[model samples]
Target: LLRAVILGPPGSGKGTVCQRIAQNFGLQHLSSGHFLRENIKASTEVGEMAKQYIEKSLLVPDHVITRLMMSELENRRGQHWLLDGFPRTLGQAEALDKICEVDLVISLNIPFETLKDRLSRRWIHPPSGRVYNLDFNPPHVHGIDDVTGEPLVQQEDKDVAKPVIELYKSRGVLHQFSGTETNKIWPYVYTLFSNKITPIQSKEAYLEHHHHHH
Candidate 1:
């Protein structure tokens, strides 16, 4: 099995690119975010446990998350897999290493200020309570009107997976990509995997979206 991990600060397009890679590479994409959402949608025990934290945009606790992820991974023992948004902490990374060998780790680094500004651009319509992100989830007319022509207001920012990044680095399998756009950074990834794996054009492994300590 070819196991891989993708790490990036939020808003770095790890989700976008991982889907593409998963589809083309025949690797099952296992995303922690999506897993949690599925559990929430199903109202599973773990999902119910994670609901509160997710609603507040907070990370689920490490033990719970690890248990959730480990169960999922245990079920996919023989498949080629790519994990996104997991093992954000050292413990999670160590736990993963114990269960499986990670073949590659991709880390995306957009400048700190860039990520901060990107997140800070989120806006909300106070009246109808409609939310807008500056680029990804924009309102109809820049910032004007949802029901009336009342201007949309940009919201604030909050919050990294640094330890996991360093872990992969120490393992000499971590490949870091620095760019503001996915297009610019994807070629390097594709080329690295070109002859290495069969590209099968399949569905994404996980729909929604990690970390650890020890």
Candidate 2:
């Protein structure tokens, strides 16, 4: 089964790309953002904690986020899945190291400054919070949600979009593509699955070195 973790900043398009990867590779797209947003609207204990951080510039504490991740593991074992945005800090990374190894980590990067600028122009659906960028992903009608025709609202908190990107970079999870284009990034992603990865037909070779350093 194919599985992965997709990491990126606020507007780096992790959702868009992860959906494509998950569908094509037959993997579940388990998004941390979606999971929390559900509870955040309901204001559950962890959701309330997440809301405080998300509303401000701060990322949710690692322990809180890691707990959310472990909840997934206990509930859904043996599922081939794509992990979308569970981790941002080194603490979360260390927690993942103890449990299991991910096949690959794909990070989507636009420039941090570019990312902030993009978010400043972005709007979201209030119910689902699906983002719509004016320049790139315009809605069917101006200031209207594509799904419900409700008014789209800007995320006025600029802090939430920019600084956290630097945090992700420092953890060595944010890989910037040389170009802004997704096609250019796709080659590097494809190359990862090409040279180092074995096909579904070839897991024996992929597992050959499993006991090496043990």
Candidate achieving the largest lDDT? 1
Provide the global lDDT of candidate 2 against the true structure: 0.58
Full-model lDDT for every candidate: 0.68, 0.58
Q: Against the true structure, what is each candidate's TM-score?
A: 0.72, 0.60
Give per-residue CA lDDT, model 1, range 1-214, as digits (tens): 6788887765666656776776567565676655765676688898878777766756578888888888888987867678876787888888998899998888876655555566443567888887754322344444565568798665657114567776788889988887568888888888665556654443243221111123
Alpha carbon lDDT at 174, candidate 2: 47
Global Cα lDDT for candidate 1: 0.68
lDDT by residue (tens digit), candidate 2, 12-37: 65545665554334345566555675
Off by over 4 Å in 1: 111-113, 120-159, 201-214
Q: How close is candidate 2 to the true structure, as a TM-score?
A: 0.60
